[PDB]
Amino acid sequence: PKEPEQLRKLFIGGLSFETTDESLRSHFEQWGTLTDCVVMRDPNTKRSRGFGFVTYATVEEVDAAMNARPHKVDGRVVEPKRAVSHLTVKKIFVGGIKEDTEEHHLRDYFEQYGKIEVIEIMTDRGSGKKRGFAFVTFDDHDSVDKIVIQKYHTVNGHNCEVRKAL
Ligand SMILES: CCNC(=O)Nc1cc(C)on1
């Protein structure tokens, strides 16, 4: 069936106060079918709060919208972010990789979530032996957001624990 609606939403900050439900929709419909599209407004003045959200029909459409950043909506560059279970970070902890996991294993898997800038396989300060965890730093937070919402990560045959770092 359909992916949970929470995973199909983009929360859009930094809107022009002149953006409306209609103009936000016309912009973001370029990347998929929108089942919902709302500019948040003050209940008394109706003046925009400067943020809103859109809901796509599928997660692949969310991906397409996020891959089309930067978005200039009604003349202003906006800030779309998905929902995670917002702590906006570019680095993940990857645990459970044991002693046989190498940089290329982590790179070949994680590079499909985003552009990698740093891979740090953690070693023991005294012995140099691998400790069984690593950190991966990407150029942008959406990679991390996609990663942490997955139930499972399999790298080098290991079932890994992945969380946002710092
Ligand atoms: C700034 C983008 N929006 C959010 O982070 N949260 C929201 C937006 C609506 C609506 O409800 N929560």
Swiss-Prot record:
Give the protein name, as stated in the record: Heterogeneous nuclear ribonucleoprotein A1
State where the record puts the cross-link Glycyl lysine isopeptide (Lys-Gly) (interchain with G-Cter in SUMO2): 2, 72, 164
Query: Any idea where the RRM domain is?
Result: 8-85, 90-166
The free-text function statement in the UniProt record for this protein reads: Involved in the packaging of pre-mRNA into hnRNP particles, transport of poly(A) mRNA from the nucleus to the cytoplasm and modulation of splice site selection. Plays a role in the splicing of pyruvate kinase PKM by binding repressively to sequences flanking PKM exon 9, inhibiting exon 9 inclusion and resulting in exon 10 inclusion and production of the PKM M2 isoform. Binds to the IRES and thereby inhibits the translation of the apoptosis protease activating factor APAF1. May bind to specific miRNA hairpins.
Region annotated Globular A domain, chain positions: 1-85
- Implicated disorder: Inclusion body myopathy with early-onset Paget disease with or without frontotemporal dementia 3: An autosomal dominant disease characterized by disabling muscle weakness clinically resembling to limb girdle muscular dystrophy, osteolytic bone lesions consistent with Paget disease, and premature frontotemporal dementia. Clinical features show incomplete penetrance. Amyotrophic lateral sclerosis 20: A neurodegenerative disorder affecting upper motor neurons in the brain and lower motor neurons in the brain stem and spinal cord, resulting in fatal paralysis. Sensory abnormalities are absent. The pathologic hallmarks of the disease include pallor of the corticospinal tract due to loss of motor neurons, presence of ubiquitin-positive inclusions within surviving motor neurons, and deposition of pathologic aggregates. The etiology of amyotrophic lateral sclerosis is likely to be multifactorial, involving both genetic and environmental factors.
Q: Which residues of the full protein are shown?
A: 7 to 181 of 372
Q: Where found in the cell? A: Nucleus; Cytoplasm
Where on this protein does the Glycyl lysine isopeptide (Lys-Gly) (interchain with G-Cter in SUMO) crosslink form? 98
